């Protein structure tokens, strides 16, 4: 049991207003046939156009919400809406495009999906709240067949061209007119009562209903993300490397060690309260401090209330020493804190749009993160960039230009001239820092933090 059986039942109640008379007893096999597609008994990698909830979750980067609304069914114009905010009007003769025949509409669909997905996924998963017109419109822009490879590379084919009779992936599809072997899932099959807006609005206040197809497409995808990544969480699912994952994760470890080590040297806290990931290891193993750990899994719905994390009777006194909240999202951090908080607003290939202002950060695992809120940091300040090192000034073993920087906190800089080793390490550290910041991570610290207190650790 890996793929969704075509002989699985499909509930058709949601389809009967667009398709009146539709049989109550229906399989994916018969639905695909009704949609105008012929599977020809093919064992060539594409067993069903529809996929399971488990397969949809493994391919969350491919999710594109899709809705079709009748403007006036062969005789009427259709408004095609996508979770990218795009609305296209197809005539059978929040971006809104005027009515155009299907032969040109399909070219725009291929361009839009290819630009949206080329850096995300090897496929497309159309996320539906199926009422009929979206399923019966697929024949106008979708072609199916055996699994194929791109004409210009080794990636699987996602597009077809009737001009050249060739296949392409999302990177090589310029000028292609058909979406080839897409996947889809109907959210209505999951067991819901009431319409799309009533279910979506139970969990999200950020997406409205401007009564256009793209609004429904966005709400459908948002509801799917809430069901799969907010109310249900699976951290065992691994996701492929599509970008700077490894560098970002290594940079995060380097920045955490640097900042915590310097906070302990500068203010000499007798105790550190490490709140978050139950599998955390001391980021500064050599530090003298009493290191106490508190378990809190990543919050995916709302940020933790600091009253629930801290109160209800541990050193008990979280006011003693310092608190470390490394990606542990709380509503309002205490004044004595070191914080790394992911900014959900960041634009990147790892950060997908989420539910109720939140975002779906996908880097090895999927983490739905609550909406970034500047008011969480009112008792803290932004942590300034700095590099600190007590290591010996010694080169060992990439040409050189002398480093001059007020933020290179080393013995050599105190002595008036940065050594080659510390200049190389400073530049590598600054690169790691900038990588982590650009990935969306934000750093905050207790107001008394002052790197001037690090210079006297060289005596
Ligand atoms: C986005 C949308 C449109 C819509 N229609 C459009 C065609 N006329 C009837 C109203 N209905 C819903 C529930 N959502
Ligand atoms: Zn290709
Ligand atoms: Zn929403
Ligand atoms: Zn040095």
UniProtKB/Swiss-Prot annotation:
Binding site for Zn(2+) 15: 200, 204, 207, 222
Subcellular location: Host cytoplasm; Host endoplasmic reticulum
Positions contributing to Mg(2+) 1 binding: 67, 134
Chain residues that bind Mg(2+) 2: 69, 211, 216
Binding positions for Zn(2+) 16 per the UniProt entry: 393, 412, 419, 422
Residue ranges of domain ExoN in the record: 49-230
GpppA-binding: region residues: 355-369
Domain N7-MTase: 239-459
Residues annotated as binding S-adenosyl-L-methionine: 274-280
Binding site for Zn(2+) 14: 150, 153, 169, 172
Domain of life, per lineage: Viruses
Residues annotated as the enzyme's active site: 67, 69, 134, 211, 216
Assembly: Interacts (via N-terminus) with DDX1. Interacts with nsp10.
Known role: Plays a role in viral RNA synthesis through two distinct activities. The N7-guanine methyltransferase activity plays a role in the formation of the cap structure GpppA-RNA. The proofreading exoribonuclease reduces the sensitivity of the virus to RNA mutagens during replication. This activity acts on both ssRNA and dsRNA in a 3'-5' direction.
Protein name, per record: Guanine-N7 methyltransferase nsp14
Organism per entry: Severe acute respiratory syndrome coronavirus 2 (2019-nCoV)
Organism classification: Viruses, Riboviria, Orthornavirae, Pisuviricota, Pisoniviricetes
Residues shown, of full length: 5949 to 6449 of 7096
């Amino acid at each position: 049991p890996t793929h969704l059986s075509v002989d699985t039942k499909f509930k058709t109640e949601g389809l009967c207003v667009d398709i009146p008379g539709i049989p109550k007893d229906m399989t994916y096999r018969r639905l695909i046939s009704m949609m105008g597609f012929k599977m020809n008994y093919q064992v060539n990698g594409y067993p069903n156009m529809f996929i399971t909830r488990e397969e949809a979750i493994r391919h969350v980067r491919a999710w594109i919400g899709f809705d079709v609304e009748g403007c006036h069914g062969t005789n009427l114009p259709l408004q095609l809406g996508f979770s990218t905010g795009v609305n296209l009007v197809a005539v059978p003769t929040p971006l809104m495009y005027k009515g155009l025949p299907w032969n040109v509409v399909r070219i725009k669909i291929v361009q839009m999906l290819s630009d949206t997905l080329k850096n995300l996924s090897d496929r497309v998963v159309f996320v539906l709240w199926a009422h009929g017109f979206e399923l019966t419109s697929m024949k106008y822009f979708v072609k199916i067949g055996p699994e194929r490879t791109c004409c210009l590379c080794d990636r699987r084919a996602t597009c077809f061209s009737t001009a050249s009779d060739t296949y392409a992936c999302w990177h090589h599809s310029i000028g292609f007119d058909y979406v080839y072997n897409p996947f889809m899932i109907d959210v209505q099959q999951w067991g819901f009562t009431g319409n799309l807006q009533s279910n979506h609005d139970l969990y999200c206040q950020v997406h409205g209903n401007a009564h256009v197809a793209s609004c429904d497409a966005i709400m459908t995808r948002c509801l799917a993300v809430h069901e799969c990544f907010v109310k249900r969480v699976d951290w065992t699912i691994e996701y492929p490397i599509i970008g700077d994952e490894l560098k970002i994760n290594a940079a995060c470890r380097k920045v955490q060690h640097m900042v915590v080590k310097a906070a302990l040297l500068a203010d000499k806290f007798p105790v550190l309260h490490d709140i978050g990931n139950p599998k955390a290891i001391k980021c500064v193993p050599q530090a003298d401090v009493e290191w106490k750990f508190y378990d809190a899994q990543p919050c995916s719905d709302k940020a933790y209330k600091i009253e629930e994390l801290f109160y209800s009777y541990h050193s008990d006194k979280f006011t003693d020493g310092v608190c470390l909240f490394w990606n542990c999202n709380v509503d309002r951090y205490p004044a004595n804190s070191i914080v790394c908080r992911f900014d959900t607003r960041v634009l990147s290939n790892l950060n997908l749009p989420g539910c109720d202002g939140g975002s779906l950060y996908v880097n090895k695992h999927a983490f739905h993160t609550p909406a970034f809120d500047k008011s969480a940091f009112v008792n803290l300040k932004q942590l300034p960039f700095f590099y600190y090192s007590d290591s010996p000034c010694e080169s060992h073993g990439i040409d050189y230009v002398p480093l001059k920087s007020a933020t290179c906190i080393t013995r050599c800089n105190l002595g008036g001239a940065v050594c080659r080793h510390h200049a190389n390490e400073y530049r590598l550290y600054l690169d790691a820092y900038n990588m982590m910041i650009s990935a969306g991570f934000s750093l905050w610290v207790y107001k008394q933090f002052d790197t001037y207190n690090l210079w006297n650790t060289f005596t």
